[PDB]
Amino acid sequence: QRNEEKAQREANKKIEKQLQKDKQVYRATHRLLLLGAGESGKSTIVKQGIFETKFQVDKVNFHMFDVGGQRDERRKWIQCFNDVTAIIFVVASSSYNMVITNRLQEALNLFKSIWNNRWLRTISVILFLNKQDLLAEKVLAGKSKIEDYFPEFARYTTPEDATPEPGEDPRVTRAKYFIRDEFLRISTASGDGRHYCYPHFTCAVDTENIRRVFNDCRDIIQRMHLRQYELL
Amino acid sequence: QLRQEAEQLKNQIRDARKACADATLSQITNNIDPVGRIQMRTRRTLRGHLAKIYAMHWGTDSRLLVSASQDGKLIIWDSYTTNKVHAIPLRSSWVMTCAYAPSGNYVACGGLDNICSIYNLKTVRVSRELAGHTGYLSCCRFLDDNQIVTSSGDTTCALWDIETGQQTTTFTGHTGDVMSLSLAPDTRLFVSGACDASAKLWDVREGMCRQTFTGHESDINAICFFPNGNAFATGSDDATCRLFDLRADQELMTYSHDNIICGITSVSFSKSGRLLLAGYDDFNCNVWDALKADRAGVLAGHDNRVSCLGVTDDGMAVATGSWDSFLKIWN
Amino acid sequence: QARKLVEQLKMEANIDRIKVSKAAADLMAYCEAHAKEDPLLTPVPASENPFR
Amino acid sequence: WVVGMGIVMSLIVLAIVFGNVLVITAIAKFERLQTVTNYFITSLACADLVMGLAVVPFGAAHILTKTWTFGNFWCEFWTSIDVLCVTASIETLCVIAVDRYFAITSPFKYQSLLTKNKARVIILMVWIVSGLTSFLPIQMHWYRATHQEAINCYAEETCCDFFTNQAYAIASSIVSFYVPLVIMVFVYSRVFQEAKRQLQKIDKSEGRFHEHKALKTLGIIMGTFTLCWLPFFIVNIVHVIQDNLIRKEVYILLNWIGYVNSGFNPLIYCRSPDFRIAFQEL
Ligand SMILES: Nc1nc2c(ncn2[C@@H]2O[C@H](COP(=O)(O)OP(=O)(O)OP(=O)(O)O)[C@@H](O)[C@H]2O)c(=O)[nH]1
Ligand SMILES: CN[C@@H]1CCc2c(ccc(O)c2O)[C@H]1O
Incomplete structure (x- = not known):
């Protein structure tokens, strides 16, 4: 009776002390979701x-989730990831001709479905446009033209404020920027400043992707704070 | 040929239950005096979870309960004195369900790792790990101290043997994700609500489906038997709740309003079965009248959407959880 | 898969079902009989309320 | 004009108390407003409430009746409370500015930098330093002036005026105003720089598909505070440096213009979706 009540309070204090240590670690870690086409x-x-990985850059802890155990066209489980820092979207940009409705259109439909969601209404997306060398190799050779698959490409011009590489043939730059604009117009169509998209061109020999993720997360948090304080 | 016969058989089932509809439930209960106005107040508030809460299960003694959260914890409370008893850290941070054994010696857990874990409270360490599902677990209930039934996102349910960790029987027939299940009071049948807007009645002993109900038009989120055991209620994401009768093989009443457009997350009955409590996405709960389909109360003390709900065995209190990492006891 | 679906429909179709009036009467009688036990319908005194 | 001036002074008292009490109850009654940033706001609200509840009414009575009736001890108590409330309200704006600076410039370490215990320690330190510069040098008669008019004022029982030395009028002015001003300026320059830098990047990447807000917000925040408190803290030094150049009425007028600032803080730091629904609920 009298002793039992004190015993319960003793165990509660020990547990509540442990929860304080776990809260410091939880609040200092950033969660990322990895998706693919x-x-x-x-x-x-x-x-x-589910597969989980951990890495640390500049004394900041990141922790990324990859889902491979569930494969369906109805993502009922996606409402769990409404508190992550950002979503990483990986798409193969060199699969316009491949049909096995081509794969770029399916990837665009998936991106459009993810962007306009009731739960992911305040989450940014980091977009990786993978397989650039294969795209350049396919574009440079003939008999394979994006016009035969994307009719809108017949009236596209490379933007004046573009950033071509040193040795690129100007043919490939137009295709790359067309593919990027396909995602960018969907991103900006329904965006009200709550979240943005950060597209990147990625290859097989790239090694600075972790720096890109770090900088994009920093920009995401800074923009969130600026919008919160009515400064943006 | 094969497809043609299915359409002919479907009409026979529909016509069979059309003649039995002599009168409606609401027509019979027109002379019953209304229950009136029901007001409830919060008695306790439980704090300590670091993230949103998805699951909750009362104890058989109506004193202790368990809850799950996305931070990777499984806390057992003492609702009377508001004292934490246990805090089990989970290997995987993605949890969707939890259960509490009738004897009180075990607790189950599961989620996005396609695995159900059983913990030994009175010994806390992992006791068994059940594998074989190819989709995320949605619910799990203890039949006994040595067997448990689970539902997953691979459109199947299973009955497990805890001692050997092997599936005794498997239930198939759904086409979408199975979202919830509930056991009968005598533990011989159970119902399941899936994403194809259908519910089914299974036989644990034999392993065959008995009846199918398809009155809804969206994904079914919650399900629960009537205390008698001859009826059950469902809740979908079209802001409607429906009551189905096992013996009549058809639905009897619908609970909806023109001012509600959000989805429904959980349902539960009261001790006598007169009241029906349902949680919604508009951050608050509602109380219905089972025999009349009219509102009688509102519980609006939660900041974020309510994800779970439960009623004690003796019917003394109602517990709700929400995404603001808080539990509340309403009396 | 077609054969299995048709077989299930035939098994489920041949069942005996009672009219809605009997089920409604049974539910109403159960609710009326077990009404006094329900603590949520009528508030209990604070002397016998463990949460107050 | 007594009835006209008495009516206006009554309205100012009601506005200060009504706004500050509403903010205090909204934060305490609701669990969604319990934030580290809101502790500074509630400290500021408490300071302004005490100021508008104690300093203003007795000063209004003294101005209207043209005499002091509460004796030679309550006059010194009133002066001490006046200085304490003025000093501790300006210094919280500095803390809010530094909090925003740390939140925006260093986003990754913000959670580790600020903690509820640290916020409580900072608030207690601010209040302690505010109390060490008002009650201690006044109740110990270290601020007393030496001329014949000053001693004649001090030796009476119905006259309660303000006379001070060079050292006190300079040190108190510096501590109350000048350091927080430069700190706030340095903070809010960097905040504006970061905001405009982030704006340039969004429109490089997605300009063709689709800094007024930051400028307006910073302009309001700095302008109200400066236009309220700068002339008084200028004449405070000037009238001590040069004698017989400022009348006894300009001092009171500028001091009351500064007092009025306490009724504007809820209109500046309490405009958000989480506050405008809490006010509607109440
Ligand atoms: N040239 C080139 N080849 C690539 C690139 N990325 C992948 N490949 C080739 O494509 C193959 C696919 O490799 P994975 O990354 O393991 O593909 P995966 O695991 O099936 O990817 P997902 O199924 O989408 O998860 C590799 O064996 C590479 O040879 C790239 O960026 N450039
Ligand atoms: C009587 N009015 C006083 C006079 C001097 C003074 C004030 C406020 C803050 C200070 O640091 C001061 O030195 C004024 O409120």
Whole structure:
């Protein structure tokens, strides 16, 4: 009676003291969700049920989730990831001709479905446009033209404020920027400043992807704070 | 040929239950005096979870309960004195369900790792791990101290043997994700609500489906038997709740309002079965009248959407959880 | 898969079902009989309320 | 004009108390407003409430009746409370500015930097330093002036005026105003720089598909505070440095213009979706 009540309070205090230590670790970690189009080469990106990985850059802890145990066209489980910092979307940009409705259109439909969601209404997306060397190799050779698959490409011009590389043939730059604009117009169509999209061009020999993720997360948090304080 | 016969058989089932509809439930209960106005107040508030809460299960003694959260914890409370008894950290941070054994010696857990874990309270360490599902677990209930039934996202349910960790029987027939299940008072039948807007009645001993109900038009989120055991209620994401009768093989009443457009997350009955409590996405709960389909109360003390709900065995209190990492006891 | 679906329909179709009036009467009688036990319908005194 | 001036002074008292009490109850009654940033706001609200409840009514009575009736001890108590409330309200704006600076410039370490215990320690330290510069040098008669008019004022029982030395009028002015001003300026320049830098990047990447807000917000925040408190803290030094150049009425007018600032803080730091629904609920 009298002794039993004191015993319960003793165990509660020890547990509540442990929960304070766990709260410090929980609040200092950033969670990321990794998605793919099915054959986008996202395993190479992470190489260099649910699968979890941990990494640290500049004394900041990141923790990324990859889902491979569930494969369906109705993502009922996606409402759990409404508190993550950002979503990483990996798409193969060199699969316009491949049909096995081509794969770029399916990837665009998936991106459009994810963007306009009731739960992911305040979450930014980091977009990786993988397989650039394959795209350049396919574009440079003839008999394979995006016009035969994307009729809108017949009236596209490379933007004046573009950033071509040193040795690129100007043919490939137009295709790259067309593919990027396809995602960008969907991103900006329904955006009200609550979240943005950060597209990048990625290859197989790239090694600075973790720096890109770090900088994009920093920008995401800074923009969130600026919008919160009515400064943006 | 094969497809043609199915359409002919479907009409026979529909016509069979059309002649039995002599009168409606609401027509019979027109002379019953209304229950009136029901007002409830919060008695306790439980704090300590670091993230949103998805699951909750009362104890058989109506004193202790368990809850789950996305931070990776499984806390057992003392609702009377508001004292934490246990805090089990989970290997995987993605949890969707939890259960509390009738004897009180075990607790189950599951989620996005396609695995159900059983913990030994009175010994806390992992006792068994059940594998074989190819989709995320949605619910789990203890039949006994040595057997448990689970539902997953691979459109199947299973009955497990805890001692050997092997599936005794498997239930198939759904086409979408199975979202919830509930056991009968005598533990011989159970019902399941899936994403194809259908509910089914299974036989644990034999392993065959008995009846199918398809009155809804969206994904079914929650399900619960009537205390008698001859009826059950469902809740979908079209802001409607429906009552189905096992013996009549058809639905009897619908609970909806023109000012509600959000989805429904959980349902539960009261001790006598007169009241029906349902949680919604508009951050608050509602109380219905089972025999009349009219509102009688509102519980609006939660900041974020309510994800779970439960009523004690003796019917003394109602517990609700929401995404603001808080539990509340309403009396 | 077609054969299995048709077989289930035939098994489920041949069942005996009672009219809605009997089920409604049974539910109403159960609710009327077990009404006094329900603590949520009528508030209990604070002397016998463990939460107050 | 007594009835006209008495009516206006009564309205100012009601506005200060009504706004500050509403903010205090909204934060305490609701669990969604219990934030580290809101502790500074509630400290500021408490300071302004005490100021508008104690300093203003007795000063209004003294101005209207033209005499002091509460004796030679309550006059010194009133002066001490006046200085304590003025000093501790300006110094909280500095804390809010530094909090926003740390939140925006260093986003990754913000959670580790600020903790409820640290916020409580900072608030207690601010209040302690505010109390060390008002009650201690006044109740110990270290601020007393030496001229014949000053001693004649001090030796009476119905006259309660303000006379001070060079050292006190300079040190108190510096501590109350000048350091927080430069700190706030340095903070809010960097905040504006970061905001405009982030704006340039969004419109490089997605300009063709689709800094007024930051400028307006910073302009309001700095302008109200400066226009309220700068002339008084200028004449405070000036009238001590040069004698017989400022009348006894300009001092009171500028001091009351500064007092009025206490009724504007809820209109500046309490405009958000989480506050405008809490006010509607109440
Ligand atoms: N040239 C080139 N080849 C690539 C690139 N990425 C992947 N590949 C090739 O494509 C193959 C696919 O590798 P993975 O990354 O493991 O593909 P995956 O695991 O099936 O990817 P997902 O199914 O989408 O998860 C590799 O064996 C590579 O040879 C790339 O960026 N450039
Ligand atoms: C009587 N009015 C006083 C006079 C001097 C003074 C004030 C406020 C803050 C200070 O640091 C001061 O030195 C005024 O409120």
